Subunit: 99 residues, 5 copies
């Protein structure tokens, strides 16, 4: 899974019927050291419910279809978790309460 | 999924019979601001009706086969949606209207 | 799917029994603007039978296994189409005729 | 599969229910000499139980769901092994 | 599929049971001309048994699970062929025979 930051939402009304109801989020990718990149993607978030500027984990490929309801939906990226902390050794790469 | 723009159309006559009557569009990926990137998919667009230079969403890999009728087709990219708006922190960065 | 150019054949005598009879082509990938890349893929072509220097559409991943006979073969790339023409808005970048 | 080093822990309290109790590790890929690269995966690690600095093998995509228990989990990276050695034959590029 | 060269063997004693008895090779990816890249990966080979310096074809993703007995194993890369030659127009750029 990749780490990304929730930046916003993508609204579509003309779309495949299997995507009806599916919330789509615009995410900004994070690199290994915790820097934001100028790379973005759109992921479904029908199961986790992440809010603005939270860090989340994205699962890509058929993994995204294991979330309930997604099995026969055409999603190749899904929000699977909201990150609270990323420990490195015993020092915090990331912490939600701070940022 | 990736935001893209319809930039072209590929015509083939000699092809797998599963692709008879499936329009083949060249979809070039865009950055967050709609600038074209050096990445593309030739992607199936059967059920949404993407036209010239609108923003669309593409799904890739086995997700492409989840669209109606694509189940047994050798497609690895599909247009799944036409974008109406994109907001970032509730500020509008894209609206199809304009 | 990606656009690519057939740039030769790969011959194997020692391979998994599943790949027996599967013709494998060395394909050079093509970018969005029609330029060849220094970047080569090996793809099954048991179905469309594409010739030397022809441009083709490649499907990757399990998509490649949807073609006749490929269902239980370890193929992750397959020729799905021979390209006659490619356009951009309304500009020829590739024509099999020309 | 890719060789990687365990570089961190990722902790989540809000997540898809199929991820409850799944250990999430930050894994940074390495080249053939063990130099860390600028690519990573957050990977599930319930099977193997790798510890910090250890070299591990990661399988990606639907392979990650083949570990017992991961079958219907939305995971696209998993630790499948801890590397002891890598023979470049009589020449040894790793030994743990 | 990718062209690679067998550069070594990966040995592991602590691993998922689904991987016991599975031979793992370290493979160096190659581009066109035959030039090794400084880009390596680890693939299963319990069905071809390629040796050192052999050029092989690698299948990735779920294709790798189509080999006999890889079906419920976490393998995303497998050796599927030993490449005899690579014929180009009327040239021919590789051949076991010579190397």
């Amino acid at each position: 899974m990749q780490i990304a930051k929730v930046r916003g939402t993508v609204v579509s009304t003309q779309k495949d019927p299997s995507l009806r109801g599916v919330k789509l989020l615009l995410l900004q990718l994070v690199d290994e050291e915790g820097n934001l990149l100028q790379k973005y993607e759109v992921a479904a978030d029908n199961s986790v419910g992440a809010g603005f500027d939270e860090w989340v984990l994205i699962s890509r490929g058929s993994a995204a279809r294991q979330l309930l309801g997604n099995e026969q939906r055409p999603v190749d990226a899904a929000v699977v978790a909201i990150i609270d902390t990323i420990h490195v050794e015993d020092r915090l790469i990331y912490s939600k309460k701070d940022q």
